[PDB]
Structure 1
Amino acid sequence: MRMFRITACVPSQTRIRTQRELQNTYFTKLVPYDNWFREQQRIMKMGGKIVKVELATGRPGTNAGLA
């Protein structure tokens, strides 16, 4: 199915983590199409900045055959 390749940077705002936090601070990952809205809203209410998003798999305007 169609997948989104995203790149984001989230800050810590409530506490100072004492462990290594690069992997969850600045990261790139593949999120599915049907889960990208909720994943995006989770990041966007968390307070991060999504610096990049692209459609990694599939093509735009896919009426049928998106699965």
Structure 2
Amino acid sequence: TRLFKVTALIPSYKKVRGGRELQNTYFTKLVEYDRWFAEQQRIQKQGGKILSVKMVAGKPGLNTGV
């Protein structure tokens, strides 16, 4: 259990901004396991929708080596 692969959609609800921000709304990124709880919380704070999460680097259910 090392790296998560998370794809999400984060619309904007507080402003209308004229730069390029398509990369900020919908993005797929790799988050560390220790980072992922806080990352998921932060995404849910902003009103984002989490589409899929997958284990990438580590192995699920490792009692050691994590």
Query: TM-score range, shorter-chain basis?
Result: over 0.9
Matches within 5 A, 1:1-67: 2-66=2-66
Q: Write the deviation string for residues 26-65 of structure 1: whole angstroms up to 9, x where unpaired.
A: 0000000001000110000110001011001111110001
Unpaired runs of at least 5, structure 1:
none
TM-score by length of 1: 0.93
Q: Distance in 2 between matches of 1:18 and 1:25?
A: 14
Ranges in structure 2 where 5+ consecutive residues have no aligned partner: none
Runs of 4+ aligned residues of structure 1 deviating over 3 Å after TM superposition are none
What SS class does the counterpart of residue 57 from structure 1 fall into? coil
Question: What's the C-alpha RMSD, in Å, of the aligned pairs?
Answer: 1.0
Q: Secondary structure at the match of 2:12?
A: coil
- Counting matched residue pairs gives 66
Task: Using the aligned pairs only, state the percent identity.
Answer: 59
Q: Give secondary structure in 1 for the equivalent of 2:13.
A: coil
| Partner secondary structure for residue 56 of structure 2 | strand
